[PDB]
Structures are given as C-alpha cells and as structure tokens.
Design a protein around this ligand. Sequence first.
Ligand SMILES: O=C(O)[C@@H]1C[C@]2(C(=O)O)C=C[C@@H](O)[C@@H](C2)O1
Ligand SMILES: O=C(O)[C@@H]1C[C@]2(C(=O)O)C=C[C@@H](O)[C@@H](C2)O1
Lengths: 117, 117, 117
Amino acid sequence: MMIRGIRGATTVERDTEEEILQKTKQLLEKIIEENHTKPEDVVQMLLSATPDLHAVFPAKAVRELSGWQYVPVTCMQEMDVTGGLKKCIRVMMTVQTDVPQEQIRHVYLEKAVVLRP
Amino acid sequence: MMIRGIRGATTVERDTEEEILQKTKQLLEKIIEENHTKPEDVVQMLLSATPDLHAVFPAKAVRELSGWQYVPVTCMQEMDVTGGLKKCIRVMMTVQTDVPQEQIRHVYLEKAVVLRP
Amino acid sequence: MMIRGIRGATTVERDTEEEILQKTKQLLEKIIEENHTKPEDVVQMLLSATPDLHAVFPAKAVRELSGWQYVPVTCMQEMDVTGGLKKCIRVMMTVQTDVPQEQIRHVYLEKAVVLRP
Ligand SMILES: O=C(O)[C@@H]1C[C@]2(C(=O)O)C=C[C@@H](O)[C@@H](C2)O1
Ligand SMILES: O=C(O)[C@@H]1C[C@]2(C(=O)O)C=C[C@@H](O)[C@@H](C2)O1
C-alpha cells in the first residue's frame, strides 16, 4: 500500500502549556476523524512550532490520544517568515493509505484557516 | 516498489521572495527531471532554510508547479551550524519508486555543490 | 513493505564536533543493533539538535557507518522549549519493516533517558 502525508495547522492565542496541548490535541483529533486514521497505520508524525512558542512540546498532546502511545513523533522549529502566521503549530502525519492524493483531508483550524488553498 | 527520500540543496544571494521562489523552483525542477518524478508518487516533502532566510516559505514554489497542488509539504528551520553554508535551502522529497537506493539522483545547485557526495 | 519511524535521542556535555559526532554515532549504532536495520531499508532520516549545539551537523556521523553512504539524511533545529532538555540530539529514522509498531525499539541514551514513555 502507498504512504501519504496528511497536513494540519492550528494556532494558539498565547504561549501556555494548556493552549498548546489543547489545540494540538484538537488538531490531531480532527485529522483522525476526517481520514479515519488508525494509529497502527501511522508511520510517524512531525510537529513544528513557530519560534514564538516555547511553553511545551506539542508532541505531548499525542499521548492524550488513547492507542497512540507507540506512534513515533518529533518536533522542530518552523522557519521565521516576515509576515507569516504567528503562534502556529503544524503537523505532517505520514500514513499508510489507499486514498488517492487529491482526496486526502488536510485540516486547518483556528487562525490557520488562512493558509488553506 | 519501495519508498525513498530524494535530497536537494541550493542557495540564494538575497533574502527576497522572488529569488527564494526562483531558486527553489529550479531545484525542484532539476530533481523532477533527474528522477522522472510524478506528483502522485510523492508521499510528502520537507523544505528547510538556514535561519538567515525570512522573505517567504520556500514551499510556495511547489504551488507554481503544474499538477503538484495536492502534494503535502511543510517547512522547517535548518540547524544553525558554525561555518555552515549560509542562505541555504534544502529539500527532502519522499517518493514511491523502483529505483535502488544507490541510484537515486540527489541534486545540489548553486553554492550547495560543495555538499555534493 | 509497511514503513515505520524509529526514534532516538541522546545528549552531549559540550558543544564540540568530536562529542556531537561520537554520541550521534553511538545512538545510531544502538538503533541499528536493536532494530536489525540494514541501510538499504532506510527510507530517509531526520536529525535534530537543540539550539545550544552549533559545532557540526549530526548527520556527518552517518558516513562513519560503513554501508550508509546512500541513506538520505537532513538536519533541523529542535524547537526551544522552556525547561526542555538541553544539548539534545534526536533522530527519526524511517524504515521499511515488518516489525509491529509496539515492538519497534526506540532508543534513549545519556541524559535523554528522561524522555522515555
Ligand atoms: O525526543 C523525545 O521523544 C521527547 C518527547 C517529545 C514528546 O513530547 O513526545 C517527542 C519528540 C521531541 O521533539 C521532544 C518531545 O522530546
Ligand atoms: O544538505 C546536505 O547534504 C549537507 C550535509 C549534511 C551532513 O553533514 O550530513 C546533511 C544534511 C544537511 O542538514 C547538512 C549536513 O548539509
């Protein structure tokens, strides 16, 4: 079976642990819903944050998902683009799937709805 | 048929949107040419920039490739390494392919030729 | 032909090329041993460093592994988390494997042992 990336983006209003975990968790839950994703079928996840977020690693939210404790995940710093969306958390979830490239459901929540094509 | 990463790297002279998109597009086009890559066979793409580039997300270049609108892509900051090549943009393009690991054609352009194997 | 991420993390005491390369090599070797990984089965690898490390790209240590010269690798900056583990190097090695997700052997060494689930 083919492997496919699934993108997500969301934002927080302030650099706190509560915000980052809550919003990341909601972002992951929305992607799982739209793509019917099962954790055994997740190759890996990459989470990024803009350099104005430091309170907590977003990946901590992944363990708030029952069954996902073995999904490998790592975080990275997003580049700082002049005029770019602030306080932004992004996800690239790599999954085993038969779903055609153009039918993959990429999820944009909160202030990240402006990045969606 | 297996999944493999394809690497690219290039540089720009000025932190401007026009040059970052021009050089990134040229890099992607060269990778596409050398590896005969179709966009539906692309699992996902990661683009990075050294911390001295801020004008635009290099991923914006991907959208000016005809047929590549559904290819998931995200950006990250390259590690800041002392004496490293400056104003550098890199790509990791993950594809489905029959080509053996030692035969994949990784691409290094402009000043990033000194990184070439 | 399922694909799975393997995670690794380690730390160094001083920001020198010698220690970064040595600890990175040791981390990779432990991962390759625990998972029985052959370089041809590696899709790609991502390595990260916290922003307190600047001496060398950790990826340089990969070419000290005989047979690994064609494995595509790139590096990124880990996000700077307040109170986060300092001087930390991480790996996400993406591999073709039939080992189930719960049996993948992720490796945490030196001071990174605190990151284990
Ligand atoms: O290396 C790690 O495993 C730890 C844990 C972590 C998480 O919170 O899940 C996952 C990935 C890393 O970016 C961070 C956060 O350090
Ligand atoms: O793009 C590259 O190929 C070069 C080489 C490098 C390494 O030292 O292995 C590997 C990946 C990149 O992050 C850096 C370091 O630039």
